[PDB]
Design a protein around this ligand. Structure first.
Ligand code: HEA
Ligand code: HEA
Ligand SMILES: [Cu+2]
Ligand SMILES: [Cu+2]
Ligand SMILES: [Cu+2]
Ligand SMILES: [Mg+2]
Ligand code: NA
Ligand SMILES: [Zn+2]
Lengths: 56, 43, 84, 98, 261, 227, 75, 514, 47, 84
């Protein structure tokens, strides 16, 4: 099979000042931004719900 | 424990204000809510 | 029963591969033949409206709220009686 | 001989892991994984506390039993002494860091 | 200071604990809408953010370990303690369930007919498929063991082979158990017998699924040369959790399937 | 019942409730000793200018403050254990009443022979006749033969409840599906009040228990007139 | 007969099984005599006892169950 | 930046602070709930309404004080802050996981709040026992929301317990044995073990109750053959250790505070102090049933549980006596915190003594579910756990902040709070001997005086907490930065100055192998 | 690492102006204490 | 019951000496007090000549060949009846 771990190492060891969860590339950012969005929205939705369900 | 004097000392006047503001912020809201209990039970 | 298959059931990958295909798997094979050499079918239990069964204190949040998740029509009767 | 293909650390360990791995074989301990064995601590034979800086906290377990450790900064310069038992400590520059 | 002289890991800020905390909210309040104001949208969102969080959190964990070289000896010794400790807490979780069971079966209420299994309940035959599942999980325990030995002996092909056999027996148990669920003549709603049998075997079932995906992850990390003969905690932990998962089944088997039926 | 400004237990109406009053004196005597011993040693430690901050030897003294408390616990445990078994002791009742907690009232059942069974609700503060106790009054008192060993079987038809009557030294949680036993036995005629000792809903505070204990004879007529 | 006496087999605070045992006992002893005549015999004791100890509700629902054939007890 | 530091953290210090913050806030809440309870009982009659709205308040009091104030503050706050510093660690073992342990709290707190918003809330007692807690007696999203709050709060704590045990065991200086770590650390390591074992069982108990009111299982419903008692066991199995999980850390901070203000190097009988905690930790696991004396259990088993519960008096005894011995030859400094320590020593004693009375099942038959037990636990929690929290807070405030508190203001606060609590809870000893039951929104007229005095007491306490807020404000208002700290040779948390730098022990301490 | 340090820099709220703090602190503990009251009001205003 | 005495029940002679006197022995002490705080005496069981007890298919090779090795006169009856 492959074994291009060494390639991955050099990449993640590259001192680009980025934090590990972004060090990987562009998709890391889209994923990040996606996850962060659904979480927030979701939180808002539940806030709306737990409130609509707070009255008779 | 030893300490440098206060970089921004709080004069008695200030302290009275601050102690006042603190007590009010605890006592007003509850006071209001409790003051109108009957009015709530009567709907 | 007991067990005493002579020697080697410890340290060495070759030994472990050996038990895998020499013991482990043949077992699963026996048990599989066995479990299917009896794989007929039970006759659906006669229905009697016992109260400590078919319990419903609150409707299931799915379907008509009266059918259990892995409801099997043949062997699982509703509270009223068998499916059909 | 004859294997199957899994990488060895000696060939795939990277970062700090590798750094501490090699230092280990050379017998040095730049990453404080082991306990510094003591010296007679006399004024002439002090304990040499390495350091990547001009000062370092030293904990002194004066007697083997001691549940209490005596802490104090050891600074660069003249050998200092544990407040509870004398015992000399002399700072020294750290080594294989980087 | 600045350049660290300790072999420990200082993890960079991560937004995962927050999204993961937020995920617990989404799923719990999500389950509440479902159970009550009958709706699954929130729960769907929750389960999603959750998978997203776990995927990225462990991703970073690998990045830091396999690529960045942060798992020194001192670092792994602590991951052992953590996993060991985590498994213990799981062992105590299943204890509530076994307790409930022995409480119910050891002293059956007159409502059950003053007997066990209660009148009306038709237990499965421990000698049929419950035996098959017993043998299956056990075999995976030996094949997973062959897998870990091949690993420490640098035999890529065989590690990958024993790991594959393991993963499949584990899936074979999931399916086998799934069908028993269907064919079984009782349900979560059939009083204590059903209640007790379906959540214990059920929580255990969720564990084999959680344990199998763990192994599957190890399978891929291996194709990718992630593990060395001497550094492969992700697999050590995978094997530990798997063995925990058999042993619980060995206890359910003897208690609920045999004695309790 | 309880009077204003009460300090201790309500007067004992049965032999075990008396028995407990004394076991509590015994125990309370000891908590006073220890808690005063500690306040003394403390004030002592804080009241001197003399210092000694060097190391001090332990255990030689720790044997003392370890063996002593063990003795004291034996001095409490024995009497306590004695009373405990004595309560759960072999008695032969000459009557068996049952009681059943319901969400906000108790129903009583006397059924050895005829099937006498009635309810028991608290008398609304409004409907109280001058002199009646504000929240303790019940419409139907459970009538029982004074000076007799009675067996009570407590239970419930809904949530948990707990049937308790202090003056007699009794409390037994009322659990649906369970029949708990308790031996009641007064030695004085009168009215002994009690309250529902287990959280159970909106009116958890409004479902009292009142025992009217009259001599056998009056019990018999009461029963018949009760159906 | 004052009331059900002490039963060593049911010696603890929890009497639930005492009520249950006797209710079963009575009905089983009844059925027995019935399927035998026995000079037309009758086992009353079990009834007087289970009568004293079992709360009305229990007996009412137990009988209802026996009528509708949904009584999980073995008689 | 703010986002990265305060929401994306991996710093034991920053996390510990966020805890104390959450803890202070929640404390404020529990304080109000506690004040409504007395406002309702300070005069015969009904103020709010039926036992439902009242008991909803009671339950919310219990949960907020235990899971949202005490636990976060003592373990997440003082625990996160001081543990890595006392053993010279760079941080915790699992920094990221640790951050999650914090972020699970607010969600858990929201659920708990929402439970009292929807329907009629959960008037069930903090023990949330069924049938009352069931879908009939308590039909609706409330109890379920209460259960989810608990699950989250539990996940958080076991996750935390894993980090503490690993850290404390695996990140000490290579030459330092566990018999060389400070008692506070031992206290937090033992507490961590207790949570790791008890919390899972609660989670299994409440998960069962949840399926019982949503998926038609009958674990605790006789209908299906269930047992309402089985729940009590499961809950109490976790319930008793919890009370010890709530005091052990306090036990630790007290050992530290008392030693420090006596001018001593170490506390009296260190290893006896270690044994004492280990024993309490262990015995606390085999005595749960003293919470079910009036339930219908066999007399023989009721005997076992009173005997086992009493033996705990022994190790606790060596602790109380060792702290008195520590004060002994001491050069005493009458600091605010030393006042909180002495207060704890006596008040906790009376309270744990009053709890020996209750160990007697015979006698517990008539004391159970009454205000006598309310007195008992308010003494060890309100003037035991909370007294430790205050001493520790005024003691380590300079370390966390870099600023000092006004000692006189600090003492007035004590003086007030002292009177408040003793007044509030002392009379309750009578209310319970004299029969007043627990969880009642009202009582027979006889009980009027004591409930009247007790509620008056509750008002003084309020004043003491309002005063504490001002005291913190002034502290940050004036800015008297620290200059000198005594006894640092034996007090490592103070060696990097106040406040310690974001990254301490970046370079390990040096400790020889003798 | 751009993390400030020292007195008043290790907390998530500004400590620069004694009066702005008085406000922030007041809202913080204030809201905490008031919430239970308004929850009870909420329940009381329902049917 | 369960068990969770916080920390140390592993490796290090000091730790094992600690459990010895800190746990092990105090237990033996409790259990010893216990076993003697109940060390009264059972009343010798009423004699009934059951056939499946006091078995003798062959005389014991010691004494009058009718007395068991640890024969205790008070609580152990011969086949005929109690010792005296
Ligand atoms: C802070 C936590 C805490 C603490 C530390 C204590 C400590 C103890 N408590 Fe507990 N108690 C509670 C908080 C806790 N408790 C709570 C929250 C409840 C009620 C919850 C509910 O049901 O809602 C409760 C309830 C409760 C019950 C149930 C009563 C009932 O409801 O019927 C029991 C009974 O055994 C009990 C006993 C004890 C004992 C024996 C100790 C022992 O630890 C005490 C040991 C201390 C000492 C004894 C003093 C020091 C030693 C000496 C000075 C030496 C001399 C001693 C002697 C020789 C006596 N308590
Ligand atoms: C930690 C636990 C704890 C604490 C501290 C308290 C504190 C208070 N409790 Fe509560 N209480 C319980 C937990 C606690 N309680 C529990 C478990 C129940 C049983 C519930 C049930 O029945 O199910 C209960 C029951 C209970 C009742 C009985 C209800 C009933 O059964 O009918 C009453 C009534 O008098 C009451 C009173 C009070 C009062 C007036 C305070 C006051 O003393 C509070 C005064 C304020 C404080 C002392 C806290 C201030 C400290 C801080 C907020 C920290 C600040 C932070 C920093 C320094 C950074 N409590
Ligand atoms: Cu009630
Ligand atoms: Cu009630
Ligand atoms: Cu307890
Ligand atoms: Mg109770
Ligand atoms: Na009132
Ligand atoms: Zn020294």
């Amino acid at each position: 099979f492959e074994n291009r771990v060494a390639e991955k190492q050099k990449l993640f060891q590259e001192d680009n000042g980025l934090p590990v969860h972004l060090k990987g590339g562009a998709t890391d950012n889209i994923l990040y931004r996606v996850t962060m969005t659904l979480c927030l929205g979701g939180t808002l939705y539940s806030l709306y719900c737990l409130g609509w369900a707070s009255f008779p | 424990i030893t300490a440098k004097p206060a970089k921004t000392p709080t004069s008695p006047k200030e302290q009275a204000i601050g102690l006042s503001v603190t007590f009010l912020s605890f006592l007003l809201p509850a006071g209001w809510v409790l003051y109108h209990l009957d009015n709530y039970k009567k709907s | 029963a007991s067990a005493a298959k002579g020697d080697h059931g410890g340290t060495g990958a070759r030994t472990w591969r050996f038990l895998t295909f020499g013991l482990a798997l043949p077992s699963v094979a026996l048990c599989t033949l066995n479990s299917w050499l009896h794989s007929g079918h039970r006759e659906r239990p006669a229905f009697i409206p016992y109260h400590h069964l078919r319990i419903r204190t609150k409707p299931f949040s799915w379907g008509d709220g009266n059918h259990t998740f892995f409801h099997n029509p043949r062997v699982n009767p509703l509270p009223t009686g068998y499916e059909k | 001989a004859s294997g199957g293909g899994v990488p060895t650390d000696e060939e795939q360990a990277t970062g700090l892991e590798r750094e501490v791995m090699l230092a280990a074989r050379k017998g040095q301990d730049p990453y404080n994984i082991l306990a510094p064995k003591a010296t007679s601590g006399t004024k002439e034979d002090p304990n040499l506390v390495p350091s990547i800086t001009n000062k370092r906290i030293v904990g002194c377990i004066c007697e083997e039993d001691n549940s209490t450790v005596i802490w104090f900064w050891l600074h660069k310069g003249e050998a200092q002494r544990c407040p509870s038992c004398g015992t000399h400590y002399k700072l020294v520059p750290h080594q294989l860091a980087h | 200071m600045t350049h660290q002289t300790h072999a420990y890991h200082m993890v960079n800020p991560s937004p995962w604990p927050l999204t993961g905390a937020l995920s617990a909210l989404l799923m719990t309040s999500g389950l509440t809408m479902w159970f009550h104001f009958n709706s699954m949208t929130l729960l769907m969102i929750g389960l999603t953010t959750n998978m997203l969080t776990m995927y990225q959190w462990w991703r970073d964990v690998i990045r830091e370990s396999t690529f960045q070289g942060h798992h020194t000896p001192a670092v792994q010794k602590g991951l052992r303690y953590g996993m060991i400790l985590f498994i213990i807490s799981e062992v105590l979780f299943f204890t509530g369930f076994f307790w409930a069971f022995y409480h119910s079966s050891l002293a059956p209420t007159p409502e059950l007919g003053g007997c066990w299994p209660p009148t009306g309940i038709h237990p499965l035959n421990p000698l049929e498929v419950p035996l098959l599942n017993t043998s299956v999980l056990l075999a995976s325990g030996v094949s997973i063991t062959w897998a870990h030995h091949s690993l420490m002996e640098g035999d890529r092909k065989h590690m990958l082979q024993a790991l594959f056999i393991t993963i499949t027996l584990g899936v074979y148990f999931t399916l086998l158990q799934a069908s028993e669920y269907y064919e079984a003549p009782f349900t979560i709603s059939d009083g204590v017998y059903g209640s007790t049998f379906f959540v214990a075997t059920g929580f255990h079932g969720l564990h084999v699924i959680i344990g199998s995906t763990f192994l599957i992850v190890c399978f891929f990390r291996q194709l990718k040369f992630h593990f060395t003969s001497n550094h492969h905690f992700g697999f050590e932990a995978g094997a530990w959790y798997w063995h925990f998962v058999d042993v619980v089944w060995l206890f359910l088997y003897v208690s609920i399937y045999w004695w309790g039926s | 019942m309880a009077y204003p400004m009460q300090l201790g237990f309500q007067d004992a109406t049965s032999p075990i409730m008396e028995e407990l009053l004394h076991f509590h004196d015994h125990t309370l005597m000891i908590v006073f000793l220890i808690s005063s011993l500690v306040l003394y040693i403390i004030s002592l430690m804080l009241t001197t200018k003399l210092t000694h901050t060097s190391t001090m030897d332990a255990q030689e003294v720790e044997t003392i403050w370890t063996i002593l408390p063990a003795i004291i616990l034996i001095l409490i445990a024995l009497p306590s254990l004695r009373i405990l078994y004595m309560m759960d002791e072999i008695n032969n009742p000459s009557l068996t009443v049952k009681t059943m907690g319901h969400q906000w009232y108790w129903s009583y059942e006397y059924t050895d022979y005829e099937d006498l069974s009635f309810d028991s609700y608290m008398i609304p503060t409004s409907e109280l006749k001058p002199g009646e106790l504000r929240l303790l009054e019940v419409d139907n008192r459970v009538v029982l033969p004074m000076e007799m060993t009675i067996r009570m079987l407590v239970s419930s038809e809904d949530v948990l409840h707990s049937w308790a009557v202090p003056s007699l030294g009794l409390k037994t949680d009322a659990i649906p599906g369970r029949l708990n036993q308790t031996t009641l036995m007064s030695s004085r005629p009168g009215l002994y009040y009690g309250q529902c000792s287990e959280i159970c809903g909106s009116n958890h505070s409004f479902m009292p228990i009142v025992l009217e204990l009259v001599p056998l004879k009056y019990f018999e007529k009461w029963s018949a007139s009760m159906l | 007969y004052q009331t059900a006496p002490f039963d060593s087999r049911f010696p603890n605070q929890n009497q639930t099984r005492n009520c249950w045992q006797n209710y079963l006992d009575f009905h089983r002893c009844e059925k027995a005599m019935t399927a035998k005549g026995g000079d037309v015999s009758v086992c009353e004791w079990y009834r007087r006892v289970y009568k004293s100890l079992c709360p009305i509700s229990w007996v009412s629902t137990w009988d209802d169950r026996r009528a509708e054939g949904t009584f999980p007890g073995k008689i | 930046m703010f986002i990265n530091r305060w929401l994306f953290s991996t710093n034991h210090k920053d996390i510990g602070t966020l805890y104390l913050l959450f803890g202070a806030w929640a404390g404020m809440v529990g304080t109000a709930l506690s004040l409504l309870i007395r406002a309702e009982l300070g005069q015969p009659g009904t103020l709010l309404g039926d036992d439902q709205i009242y008991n909803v308040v009671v339950t919310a009091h219990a949960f907020v004080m235990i899971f949202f104030m005490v636990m976060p503050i003592m373990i997440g706050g003082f625990g996160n802050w001081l543990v890595p510093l006392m053993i010279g660690a760079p941080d915790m073992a699992f920094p990221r996981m640790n951050n999650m342990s914090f972020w699970l709290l607010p969600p858990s707190f929201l659920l708990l709040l929402a439970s009292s918003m929807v329907e009629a809330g959960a008037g069930t007692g903090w023990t949330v026992y069924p049938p009352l807690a069931g879908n009939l007696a308590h039909a609706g999203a409330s109890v379920d929301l209460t259960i989810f709050s608990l699950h989250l709060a539990g996940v958080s704590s076991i996750l935390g317990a894993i980090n503490f045990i690993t850290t404390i065991i695996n990140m000490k200086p290579p030459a330092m044995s566990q018999y060389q770590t400070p008692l506070f650390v031992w206290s937090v390591m033992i507490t961590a073990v207790l949570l790791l074992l008890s919390l899972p069982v609660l989670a299994a108990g409440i998960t069962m109750l949840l399926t019982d009111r949503n998926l038609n299982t009958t674990f605790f419903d006789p209908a299906g053959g269930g047992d309402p008692i089985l729940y009590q066991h499961l809950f109490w199995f976790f319930g008793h250790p919890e009370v010890y999980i709530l005091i052990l850390p306090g036990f630790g901070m007290i050992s530290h505070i008392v030693t420090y203000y006596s001018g001593k190097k170490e506390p009296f009988g260190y290893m006896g102090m270690v044994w004492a905690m280990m024993s309490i930790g262990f015995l606390g696991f085999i005595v749960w049933a003293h919470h079910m004396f009036t339930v219908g259990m066999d007399v023989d088993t009721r005997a076992y549980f009173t005997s086992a519960t009493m033996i705990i008096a022994i190790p606790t005894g060596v602790k109380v006596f060792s702290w008195l011995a520590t004060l002994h030859g001491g050069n005493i400094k009458w600091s605010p915190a030393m006042m909180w320590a002495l207060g704890f020593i006596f008040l906790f004693t009376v309270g744990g003594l009053t709890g020996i009375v209750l160990a007697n099942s015979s006698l517990d038959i008539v004391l159970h579910d009454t205000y006598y037990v309310v007195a008992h636990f308010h003494y060890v929690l309100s003037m035991g756990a909370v007294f430790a929290i205050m001493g520790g807070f005024v003691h380590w405030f300079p370390l966390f902040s870099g600023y000092t508190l006004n000692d006189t203001w600090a003492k007035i606060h004590f003086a007030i709070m002292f009177v408040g609590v003793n007044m509030t809870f002392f009379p309750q000893h009578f209310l319970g001997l004299s029969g007043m039951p627990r969880r009642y929104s009202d009582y027979p007229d006889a009980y009027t005086m004591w409930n009247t005095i007790s509620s008056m007491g509750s008002f003084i306490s309020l004043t003491a907490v309002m005063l504490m807020v001002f005291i913190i404000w002034e502290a940050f208002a004036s800015k008297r930065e620290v200059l000198t700290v005594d006894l640092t040779t034996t007090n490592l948390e103070w060696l990097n100055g106040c406040p310690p730098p974001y990254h301490t022990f970046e370079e390990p301490t040096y400790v020889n192998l003798k | 690492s751009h993390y400030e340090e020292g007195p008043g820099k290790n907390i998530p709220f500004s400590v620069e102006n004694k009066w702005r703090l008085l406000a922030m602190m007041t809202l913080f503990f204030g809201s905490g204490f008031a919430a239970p009251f308004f929850i009870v009001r909420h329940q009381l205003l329902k049917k």
